[PDB]
Amino acid sequence: PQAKYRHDYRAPDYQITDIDLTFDLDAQKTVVTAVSQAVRHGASDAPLRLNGEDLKLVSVHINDEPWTAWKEEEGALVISNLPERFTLKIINEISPAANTALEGLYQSGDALCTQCEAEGFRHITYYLDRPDVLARFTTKIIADKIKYPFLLSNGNRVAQGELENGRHWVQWQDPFPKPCYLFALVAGDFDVLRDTFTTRSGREVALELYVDRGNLDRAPWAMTSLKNSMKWDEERFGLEYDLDIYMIVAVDFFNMGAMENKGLNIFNSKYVLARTDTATDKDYLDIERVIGHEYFHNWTGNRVTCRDWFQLSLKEGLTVFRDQEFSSDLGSRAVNRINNVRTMRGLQFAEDASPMAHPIRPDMVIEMNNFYTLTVYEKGAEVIRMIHTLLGEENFQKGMQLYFERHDGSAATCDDFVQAMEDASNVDLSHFRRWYSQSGTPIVTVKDDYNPETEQYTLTISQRTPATPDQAEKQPLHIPFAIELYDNEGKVIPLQKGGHPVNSVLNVTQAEQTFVFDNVYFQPVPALLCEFSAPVKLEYKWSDQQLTFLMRHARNDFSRWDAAQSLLATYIKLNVARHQQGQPLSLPVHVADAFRAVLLDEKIDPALAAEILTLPSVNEMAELFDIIDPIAIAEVREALTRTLATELADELLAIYNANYQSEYRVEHEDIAKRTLRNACLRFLAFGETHLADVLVSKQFHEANNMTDALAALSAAVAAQLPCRDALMQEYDDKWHQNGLVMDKWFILQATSPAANVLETVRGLLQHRSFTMSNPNRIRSLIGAFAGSNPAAFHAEDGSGYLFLVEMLTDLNSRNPQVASRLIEPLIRLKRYDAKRQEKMRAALEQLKGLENLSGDLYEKITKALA
Ligand SMILES: N[C@@H](Cc1c[nH]c2ccccc12)C(=O)O
Ligand code: NA
Ligand code: NA
Ligand SMILES: [Zn+2]
């Protein structure tokens, strides 16, 4: 497999302006007829090079003349000796039923559906499968009427007819030129939820949600979320939907989350289907986020698309930023920010420290499907958010407006977007652009001094980004570094110098810099990197008392949570070192006291309290350490939970009881109380065994919603309570027919602290609700074990690695995209001790030797073994 390079970008030799597709659909053999209007832009002797994968070519015509001047080669059809403008007609066959990779045209249950991003359309026909080629599509679909009564593609229905032998057809036209990755086709039999949204300017939009027969009871929340998304994009960004119909199809078999195909989004059913007895608060909020995300792509991705795939973050960073802003505006901004920061520090930082490290705009890609990453998406959003911090909302929106004005109807670059922001705002972003080209996580070190003689406070701030495997050279970035200074009363000290106010967002642009503030009338307690103002590691020598002071006094809820994280980090590190020496947990009394105060504080938002009372995950804890000890981390997390459960037992029960809610509502105040109550339950499960078992079993059985039922079941598994097996069996018996609900149970099985977890996981490969044919099942059982049970995955006997090798040997052939998701825990080997590294290296070497090794795995394995 050959690497492709961003610096090799060249405008295409040919454009296609219009394509008319016909599908004669059948699961075994689909015939595709594609009639494209092409125009040569390059040299008169340049051949037309069409991408194609696994196609059976039937015929090639140019202006209806059977063409003799062509050859097929690896991944391509190369057509020579063409006029400047011509009609290309290709007929080819494909086999949806044979498509286990779920890219191109494939089967999802009884339905046929497509996935074309990034380079899936070339699995359907020979085409210019590159996103800077935009064409107007029309799509004719011919199929068996009984099997496929609904035949959907992008845009509007313009023709329909009936044929002999029980077949029918529909033709669709989408007026907006698009790259082929935004093409979609769906055929099948569905229940349809229909509704309407009227845009602010009065365009009435038909909304249609297609779900498997029998699932209409689970569709209204997604529909509500769609309307919410449409309204928000109007209010916040001034953007209206631009077509007459908005279709969403929920499919059970899907490699990712959802796909923004113009006017015909295709969603993993996990991000559509919800009922109060099947879905948790988190599921509801995820459906909201993902519905919003795909909707927001209509402008940031569709109306303006990507010139090439190295520009992926142009749409993904900006659309993730938009979905976060949406969720934050509608819900708790603090809880959203907190959770997004947990993801950055606990998951994205790990990727940036790994062999797969890349800038948000990559320079080199072998398999583009490998680059739909925490970096491109989540760090991409942090970079957008930094622009927002630097510009402020008004200038940011001016930048958005200039971006659309310039680039609407075209494929653009990351640099185009940055230039629009810079030009609209008059803020210089030339240095800022390095965030697009540099990989790795900057470390920002802060030292301070208070001078009582002069009433000056001095911050000396330094930065460095360690070298990464992809980049030997690193340079200083433009880091927006937000601060707040507090006096002894918890009041904010005005920032000023030489008689002028100073902006609280410091521009940290050098390797080292000093900032001096005057009229600092009392020695301050600083709040540093407020609202996680840049995606960086902060090094500052906090005292415990400074941190508990911030937990009490900090103005923004994020700062209060973040101070608690810094307080915990010190004692997590302490207790992991202790674990390694065979010593039990040690925690100062004043630390337990800070958490008691949070529990008992009547004024604190329960949403905030709940997050402070949610310990960092084992993945967040891992990032505190150069070399990860996953067993020590897991056991310390449990010991810390048990210690707090004992110290806080009375308070935890009081708050648990106080937050009881008889009515279940998917409403932010109720969700916040429930999140707090269940945070309390988690500790209570790890307290005195009989009371724990009673509380947990009672909640599981009395729950009137899945959030409370699953919180109880999860606690029973985590604390290995007596009731565990009975409750787990009860859930299986009730829910085994429901794959999405069973995913929750597979996750609990996979992440269990039980000594025999791997045995159980292997046995579950035979479970009635599990199948290797479904990405959701695979991720919930196998992915959760390897990625979310590092203590078991990294068992000292190497059994976890051997298990994953077995699974990846299957998935490499079946579904390389899912295989490549699942190999990630193995490529982290350099973070582990020598003995583990050698077993992980052996595992990777076994996979490297596989017959028919996918490009997806090849790329990751070679980087890991380098
Ligand atoms: N474009 C989708 C992501 C996606 C869905 N399916 C895919 C398959 C391959 C690559 C990306 C995807 C999004 O970010 O909203
Ligand atoms: Na809000
Ligand atoms: Na100091
Ligand atoms: Zn996206």
Helix (H) or strand (E) run with residue 834 in it: helix 834-848
The reply to whether 6 falls in a domain is no
Residues 6+ apart with CB under 8 A from 327: 285, 288, 289, 292, 336
What is the spatial distance between Cα 325 and Cα 291, in angstroms, rounded to a whole number? 14
| Residue 622 CB neighbours (<10 A) | 21
Three-state secondary structure readout of 679-717: HHHHHHCCCCHHHHHHHHHHHHHHCCCHHHHHHHHHHHH
What distances in angstroms separate CA 360 from CA 293, 310, 363, 433, one per listed residue? 19, 9, 9, 11
Spatial contact of 172 and 138, defined as CB atoms under 8 Å apart: yes
Closest to 516 measured CA to CA, from 496, 486, 533: 496
| Residue 240 CB neighbours (<10 A) | 17
Token couple for 186: 């769906």
Helix (H) or strand (E) run with residue 838 in it: helix 834-848
Q: What are the phi and psi torsion angles at 780 (to 5°)?
A: -75, -30
Same structural domain for residues 435 and 452? Answer: no
DSSP notation for 434-457: HHHH--S--EEEEEEEEETTTTEE
The reply to whether 202 falls in a domain is yes
What is the spatial distance between Cα 686 and Cα 642, in angstroms, rounded to a whole number? 5
DSSP 121: G
Spatial contact of 233 and 300, defined as CB atoms under 8 Å apart: no
Ramachandran region, residue 527 (left: φ > 0; alpha: ψ -120 to 50; beta: rest):
beta
Which residue owns the Cα nearest ligand 1 atom 6?
256
Closest to 167 measured CA to CA, from 71, 26, 367: 26
Same structural domain for residues 689 and 796? Answer: yes
What is the spatial distance between Cα 560 and Cα 558, in angstroms, rounded to a whole number? 5
Which residue owns the Cα nearest ligand 1 atom 15?
259
> Which amino acid, 399?
G
Same structural domain for residues 337 and 404? Answer: yes
What is the spatial distance between Cα 674 and Cα 676, in angstroms, rounded to a whole number? 5
Burial 678-691 (b: 16+ CB within 10 A, else e): bbbbbbbbbbeeee
For 142, the 3-state DSSP assignment is: strand
The C-alpha angle 572, 576, 581, rounded to 5 degrees, equals 150
Does residue 305 line the site of ligand 1, with CB under 6 A? Answer: no
Spatial contact of 812 and 849, defined as CB atoms under 8 Å apart: no
Helix (H) or strand (E) run with residue 864 in it: helix 855-865
Does residue 422 line the site of ligand 1, with CB under 6 A? Answer: no
What distances in angstroms separate CA 610 from CA 257, 548, 685, one per listed residue? 27, 17, 16
Spatial contact of 518 and 455, defined as CB atoms under 8 Å apart: yes
What is the spatial distance between Cα 30 and Cα 142, in angstroms, rounded to a whole number? 10
Same structural domain for residues 223 and 161? Answer: no
Spatial contact of 496 and 459, defined as CB atoms under 8 Å apart: no
Token couple for 259: 């796909």
Closest to 840 measured CA to CA, from 802, 809, 789: 802
Q: Using the structure block, give the residue that is written with the tokens 């009375």.
A: 650
Does residue 376 line the site of ligand 1, with CB under 6 A? Answer: no
Percentages helix, strand, coil for the chain, rounded to the nearest 5? 45, 20, 35
Single residue among 244, 275, 306 that ends a domain in this structure: 275
Closest to 134 measured CA to CA, from 160, 114, 154: 154
The reply to whether 418 falls in a domain is yes
Token couple for 646: 């004992």
Count helices and strands (H / E) in the chain: 29, 33
Nearest-atom number in ligand 1 for the CA of 368 is: 10
| Residue 344 CB neighbours (<10 A) | 21
Does residue 259 line the site of ligand 1, with CB under 6 A? Answer: yes
Residues 6+ apart with CB under 8 A from 811: 772, 778, 818, 819, 822
261 appears as a binding residue in the annotation: yes
What is the spatial distance between Cα 434 and Cα 353, in angstroms, rounded to a whole number? 18
Single residue among 190, 215, 242 that ends a domain in this structure: 190
Does residue 856 line the site of ligand 1, with CB under 6 A? Answer: no
CA 518 distance to own-chain centroid: 43
Helix (H) or strand (E) run with residue 137 in it: strand 135-144
Closest to 306 measured CA to CA, from 243, 362, 265: 362
Closest to 612 measured CA to CA, from 679, 657, 543: 679
Q: What are the phi and psi torsion angles at 614 (to 5°)?
A: -105, 110
Q: What are the phi and psi torsion angles at 22 (to 5°)?
A: -125, 130
Q: Which domain holds residue 493?
A: 440-541
Q: Using the structure block, give the residue that is written with the tokens 């002797």.
A: 45
Residues 6+ apart with CB under 8 A from 688: 649
Strand runs labelled E in 490-642: 496-497, 500-501, 505-508, 512-517, 525-528, 537-539
Q: What is the CATH number of the domain that holds 261?
A: 3.30.2010.30
Pairing relationship of beta strands 185-188 and 111-115 according to DSSP bridges? antiparallel
Token couple for 643: 């210690």
The reply to whether 1 falls in a domain is no
Token couple for 312: 């992926």
* 294 noted as active-site residue: yes
DSSP 127: B
Residues 6+ apart with CB under 8 A from 194: 206, 207, 208, 209
**How many structural domains compose the chain?**
5
Token couple for 357: 């490290």
Q: What is the CATH number of the domain that holds 526?
A: 2.60.40.1840
Spatial contact of 676 and 613, defined as CB atoms under 8 Å apart: yes
Closest to 412 measured CA to CA, from 318, 316, 301: 301
Bridge-partner residues for 24, per DSSP? 31, 142
Q: Rounded to the nearest 10 degrees, what angle do helices 668-684 and 630-647 cross at?
A: 100
Protein residues within 5 Å, CB atom, of ion ligand 4: 316, 319
What is the spatial distance between Cα 226 and Cα 665, in angstroms, rounded to a whole number? 19
What is the spatial distance between Cα 439 and Cα 752, in angstroms, rounded to a whole number? 35
Pairing relationship of beta strands 204-212 and 245-251 according to DSSP bridges? parallel
Method used to determine the 3D structure: X-ray
Q: What is the CATH number of the domain that holds 311?
A: 1.10.390.10
Residues in the chain: 866
Bridge-partner residues for 458, per DSSP? 449, 516
Closest to 266 measured CA to CA, from 184, 200, 165, 364: 184
What is the spatial distance between Cα 543 and Cα 541, in angstroms, rounded to a whole number? 7
The C-alpha angle 616, 620, 622, rounded to 5 degrees, equals 120
Token couple for 361: 């705009």
Token couple for 297: 């792509």
Residues 6+ apart with CB under 8 A from 203: 240, 241, 244
Pairing relationship of beta strands 443-451 and 456-464 according to DSSP bridges? antiparallel
DSSP notation for 287-314: HHHHHHHHHHTTTBTTTEEESSGGGHHH
Spatial contact of 243 and 209, defined as CB atoms under 8 Å apart: no
Q: Rounded to the nearest 10 degrees, what angle do helices 557-580 and 544-553 cross at?
A: 150
316 appears as a binding residue in the annotation: yes
Spatial contact of 615 and 571, defined as CB atoms under 8 Å apart: no
Helix (H) or strand (E) run with residue 657 in it: helix 649-658
Token couple for 8: 């090799």
Spatial contact of 35 and 60, defined as CB atoms under 8 Å apart: no
What is the spatial distance between Cα 295 and Cα 276, in angstroms, rounded to a whole number? 24
Q: What is the CATH number of the domain that holds 138?
A: 2.60.40.1730
Token couple for 427: 């803020």
DSSP 766: T
Closest to 554 measured CA to CA, from 525, 588, 595, 522: 525
Helix (H) or strand (E) run with residue 178 in it: strand 167-178
Does residue 115 line the site of ligand 1, with CB under 6 A? Answer: yes
Mutation choice for ligand 1 from 103, 249, 255, CB with most ligand atoms inside 8 A? 255
Closest to 748 measured CA to CA, from 773, 772, 781: 781
Q: How many CA atoms lie within 13 A of 404 on its CB side?
A: 16
Q: What are the phi and psi torsion angles at 190 (to 5°)?
A: -135, 155
Q: Which ligand is nearest to the CA of 335?
A: 2
Ramachandran region, residue 742 (left: φ > 0; alpha: ψ -120 to 50; beta: rest):
alpha
Long-range interactions of 62-71: CB distance < 8 A, separation 24+ = 62/86, 62/87, 62/88, 62/89, 63/87, 64/89
| Residue 159 CB neighbours (<10 A) | 11
For 848, the 3-state DSSP assignment is: helix
Same structural domain for residues 677 and 782? Answer: yes
The reply to whether 607 falls in a domain is yes
Single residue among 481, 509, 541 that ends a domain in this structure: 541
| Residue 555 CB neighbours (<10 A) | 15
Residues 6+ apart with CB under 8 A from 578: 584, 585, 586
Same structural domain for residues 698 and 838? Answer: yes
Three-state secondary structure readout of 360-414: CCCCEECCHHHHCCHHHHHHHHHHHHHHHHHHHHHHHHHHHHHHHHHHCCEEECH
Same structural domain for residues 738 and 824? Answer: yes
Closest to 388 measured CA to CA, from 492, 505, 501, 529: 505
State the catalytic residue, choosing from 119, 208, 294, 647. Answer: 294
Same structural domain for residues 270 and 293? Answer: no
Spatial contact of 133 and 12, defined as CB atoms under 8 Å apart: yes
Same structural domain for residues 696 and 784? Answer: yes
Question: Using CB atoms within 10 A of its CB, is residue 814 exposed (0-12), middle (13-18) or buried (19+)?
Answer: middle
The reply to whether 5 falls in a domain is no
Ramachandran region, residue 314 (left: φ > 0; alpha: ψ -120 to 50; beta: rest):
alpha
257 appears as a binding residue in the annotation: yes
Same structural domain for residues 829 and 771? Answer: yes
Q: Using the structure block, give the residue that is written with the tokens 């093409």.
A: 183
Helix (H) or strand (E) run with residue 151 in it: strand 150-153
Which residue owns the Cα nearest ligand 1 atom 2?
259
Residues 6+ apart with CB under 8 A from 68: none
Give me the torsion for CA of 848, 854, 857, 860, rounded to 10°: 90
Burial 4-33 (b: 16+ CB within 10 A, else e): bebeeeeebbbbbeebbbbbbbbbeebbbb
The reply to whether 4 falls in a domain is no
What is the spatial distance between Cα 768 and Cα 771, in angstroms, rounded to a whole number? 8
Q: What is the CATH number of the domain that holds 716?
A: 1.25.50.10
What is the spatial distance between Cα 844 and Cα 824, in angstroms, rounded to a whole number? 11
For 155, the 3-state DSSP assignment is: coil
400 appears as a binding residue in the annotation: no
What distances in angstroms separate CA 37 from CA 17, 134, 202, one per listed residue? 6, 12, 35
What is the spatial distance between Cα 310 and Cα 435, in angstroms, rounded to a whole number? 14
Instruction: Using the mean position of ligand 1's atoms as its centre, give its distance from the Cα of residue 855 in Å.
Output: 18
Token couple for 346: 């606990």
DSSP notation for 85-112: EEEEEEEEEE-GGG--S--EEEEETTEE
Closest to 207 measured CA to CA, from 192, 221, 191: 192
Q: Rounded to the nearest 10 degrees, what angle do helices 281-296 and 220-232 cross at?
A: 50
Nearest-atom number in ligand 1 for the CA of 254 is: 6
Closest to 458 measured CA to CA, from 424, 483, 436: 483
| Residue 217 CB neighbours (<10 A) | 12
CA 378 distance to own-chain centroid: 7
Closest to 253 measured CA to CA, from 101, 123, 118, 116: 101
Instruction: Using the mean position of ligand 3's atoms as its centre, give its distance from the Cα of residue 551 in Å.
Output: 20
Work out the widest C-alpha separation in the chain, in whole angstroms.
Answer: 96
First to last CA, the chain: 16
CA 36 distance to own-chain centroid: 35
Spatial contact of 222 and 209, defined as CB atoms under 8 Å apart: yes
Long-range interactions of 537-543: CB distance < 8 A, separation 24+ = 537/349, 537/441, 537/442, 537/443, 537/444, 538/444, 538/446, 539/443, 539/444, 539/445, 539/446, 540/445, 540/446, 540/447, 540/448, 541/447, 542/566, 542/567, 542/570
Same structural domain for residues 70 and 205? Answer: no
Closest to 93 measured CA to CA, from 137, 144, 52: 52
Spatial contact of 330 and 429, defined as CB atoms under 8 Å apart: no
Token couple for 300: 């940031």
The reply to whether 772 falls in a domain is yes
What distances in angstroms separate CA 498 from CA 14, 450, 517, 519, one per listed residue? 61, 17, 8, 9
Mutation choice for ligand 1 from 102, 103, 115, 259, CB with most ligand atoms inside 8 A? 259
Omega before 334 within 30 of 0, i.e. cis: no
What is the spatial distance between Cα 440 and Cα 289, in angstroms, rounded to a whole number? 27
Helix (H) or strand (E) run with residue 464 in it: strand 456-464
Residues 6+ apart with CB under 8 A from 384: 317, 318, 320, 321
The C-alpha angle 116, 290, 273, rounded to 5 degrees, equals 95
Same structural domain for residues 360 and 456? Answer: no
Closest to 445 measured CA to CA, from 505, 383, 508: 508
Token couple for 65: 């003349």
Which residue owns the Cα nearest ligand 1 atom 9?
117
